[PDB]
Structure 1
Amino acid sequence: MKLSLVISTSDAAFDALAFKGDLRKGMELAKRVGYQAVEIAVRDPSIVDWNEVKILSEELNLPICAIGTGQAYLADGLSLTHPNDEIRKKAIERVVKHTEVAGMFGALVIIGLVRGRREGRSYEETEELFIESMKRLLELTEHAKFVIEPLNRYETDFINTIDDALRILRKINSNRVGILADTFHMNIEEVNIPESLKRAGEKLYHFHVADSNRWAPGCGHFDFRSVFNTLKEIGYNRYVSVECLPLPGGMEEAAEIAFKTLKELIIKL
């Protein structure tokens, strides 16, 4: 297993210099603390100079392991299940742009809130629309790999558990789509987290960690020990990525606390 840090970046349209500064600050922090990769989240990649990002990654020897897309929903209203087919098409087109960036870095593309909500419809219809959008994304991309992140009930009513996602993966039937499990969301939605991760098995492609309060791992009451025993049992050997509030004590202190907690769990496997 490898350790990665999610870094928050200002949106480049709403402040170009701030995006670049946030990115460099966070990557330098990740490197200093000892993380092996970073993870980012961008709303619209069209407005970022990714050649410059690649140079920074090369300078610091820090790959970008995953790219989040949720701001395309929260800020721009784009959803892969939107009842308006015009918006569904625009959401597919936006995510294609994320895959173009991801291909420069070998990064996973995260399907979180960009999948959209039920919006008063049946789960069945929402799921069918989503599967159609994912199949279109697979037809549109030759190399992109996607991970579906189950999210808690307050963020969405569509895909709340690992099982919800596994059912969808069986219908999509592509090894280019897997699961991103997140301990903060699982702490609410999963009955037995070790059992849920065993069911995921080889389909677990990426992993987000934060404590029960979404603070740095170690600063709540989530049982990471049982989780890491299960990750070893299933042979998980990809990224464990810290996605936590900058607490306690700010972004640097949280990243350091998280790293120390996770390193001790990993080294004792």
Structure 2
Amino acid sequence: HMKLSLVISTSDAAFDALAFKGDLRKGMELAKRVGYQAVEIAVRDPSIVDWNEVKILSEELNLPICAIGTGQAYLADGLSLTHPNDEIRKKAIERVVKHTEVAGMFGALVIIGLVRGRREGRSYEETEELFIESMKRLLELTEHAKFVIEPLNRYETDFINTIDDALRILRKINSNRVGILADTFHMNIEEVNIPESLKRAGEKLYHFHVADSNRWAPGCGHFDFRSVFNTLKEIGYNRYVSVECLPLPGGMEEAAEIAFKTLKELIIKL
């Protein structure tokens, strides 16, 4: 009952509103043509996008938006939920609230990846406490939003690198509106035994990102997707499997097609 989704890259609408709209339309039409059941997007600042135009596009194509990424809020705007400057922490929370407003229009998950920030020379314990405070604030501020924490590899952050790191935090937050997003590219570096890590996540696995070991289309590296999909079946995972990969080999369209074929075969034989 798993469903396949495609992450589509979009230009920043502040830089070029027409480019954003063009990228989005092209990406959603590509997704539908290949066979994906939903798309996933990433936006830096939701306040500059016309979301009713996006919803019309989603309706016309019968293509839901299943998740909204937030990482550029950190990479471009320096906003972090654990920033040592409480003013920036507040601005980060305010930004992510705007992401939840968009997510509510689509029934989408809000991804908490890089926007959580890094240790920045501090103890893990302090960073974790600040993060939990910020997540609790986000939950107090929202009635329906659902969040997923994505463990990322050591080169992207030193805060939450493993599924176990995230499960520990979920137990402290204590809300079913926060779960885990596992990403096979990141797990290939950070997890000891990936099937075991996913069993530990269990019901807390709310979303799934796939890319091969080199972050190319699934099928084009050496990651063992077979064992992963066996485990997803065993834990009863029935939500989205979202392709978040480099446009390789051979560009965005070719990568999306290769990814779909690889994943579809695994799912159907499972």
TM-score category, normalised to shorter length: over 0.9
Deviation digits for residues 51-94 of structure 1, max 9, x if unmatched?
A: 00000000000000000000000000000000000000000000
Q: CA deviation at 1:164?
A: 0.1
For 1:18 and 1:189, the matched residues in 2 are separated by 36
Aligned length: 269
Q: CA deviation at 1:168?
A: 0.1
Q: CA deviation at 1:142?
A: 0.0
Deviation digits for residues 19-75 of structure 1, max 9, x if unmatched?
A: 000000000000000000000000000000000000000000000000000000000
For 2:225 and 2:82, the matched residues in 1 are separated by 34
Q: CA deviation at 1:214?
A: 0.2
For 1:11 and 1:215, the matched residues in 2 are separated by 23
User: What 5-or-longer segments of structure 2 have no aligned partner?
Assistant: none
SS of match in other structure, 2:6: strand
Deviation digits for residues 111-163 of structure 1, max 9, x if unmatched?
A: 00000000000000000000000000000000000000000000000000000
SS of match in other structure, 1:38: strand
For 2:71 and 2:267, the matched residues in 1 are separated by 29
Q: CA deviation at 1:218?
A: 0.1
Alignment match, 1:199? 200
* Corresponding position: 1:184 with 2:185: yes
Alignment match, 1:94? 95
SS of match in other structure, 2:207: strand
Q: CA deviation at 1:185?
A: 0.1
SS of match in other structure, 1:133: helix
Instruction: Please report the TM-score for the alignment, with normalisation by the length of structure 1.
Output: 1.00
Alignment match, 1:26? 27
Q: CA deviation at 1:256?
A: 0.2
User: What 5-or-longer segments of structure 1 have no aligned partner?
Assistant: none
For 1:172 and 1:39, the matched residues in 2 are separated by 25
SS of match in other structure, 1:232: helix
Deviation digits for residues 188-235 of structure 1, max 9, x if unmatched?
A: 000000000000000000000000000000000000000000000000
For 1:200 and 1:149, the matched residues in 2 are separated by 12
For 2:45 and 2:17, the matched residues in 1 are separated by 13
Which 4+ runs in 1 deviate beyond 6 A?
none
Alignment match, 1:7? 8
Q: CA deviation at 1:170?
A: 0.1
SS of match in other structure, 1:9: coil
RMSD over equivalenced CA pairs, Å: 0.1
SS of match in other structure, 2:255: helix
Sequence identity percentage? 100
Alignment match, 1:43? 44
For 1:24 and 1:213, the matched residues in 2 are separated by 27
For 2:53 and 2:4, the matched residues in 1 are separated by 24
SS of match in other structure, 1:118: coil
Instruction: Please report the TM-score for the alignment, with normalisation by the length of structure 2.
Output: 1.00
For 1:122 and 1:15, the matched residues in 2 are separated by 40
